[PDB]
Ligand binder design. Structure first.
Ligand code: NAG
Ligand code: NAG
Ligand code: NAG
Lengths: 50, 49
């Protein structure tokens, strides 16, 4: 944290190899969850018998 | 056996060698400020700033 460095040997850190690629790996499931079927039911339940 | 006119004078001697151990130095260590706390995370490094 200075613009000038004295003579000696200094321990540095984080030599700035910053990543530039982002990858994603997900399973092979492709079918969509039946949210419409669940939400489209004629009757849901009673609260005491959920 | 103390007395006011009695003395004891040694006749022989022994040559003894003893040992003394004294620590002089310990291990020198260094710690990374960022990689210990927020290891490999730009968001956490920004917060640590
Ligand atoms: C419920 O399902 C029927 C037939 O599958 C469909 O005609 C109806 O539009 C659905 N209801 C809603 C709110 O999407
Ligand atoms: C001390 O020395 C005197 C002689 O000067 C002697 O009479 C006396 O007994 C000695 N003391 C003891 C405790 O022996
Ligand atoms: C001193 O001790 C050594 C070892 O036991 C022995 O050989 C020697 O004779 C002794 N000297 C005297 C004067 O008693």
């Amino acid at each position: 944290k200075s613009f000038t460095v004295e003579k000696g040997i200094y321990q540095t850190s984080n030599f700035r190899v910053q990543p530039t690629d982002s990858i994603v790996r997900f399973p092979n499931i492709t079918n969509l969850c039946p949210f419409g079927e669940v939400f489209n039911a004629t009757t849901f339940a009673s609260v005491y018998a959920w | 056996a103390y007395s006011n006119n009695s003395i004891a004078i040694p006749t022989n001697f022994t040559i003894s060698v003893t040992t003394e151990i004294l620590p002089v130095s310990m291990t020198k260590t260094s710690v990374d400020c960022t990689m210990y706390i927020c290891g490999d995370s730009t968001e956490c490094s920004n917060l640590l700033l």
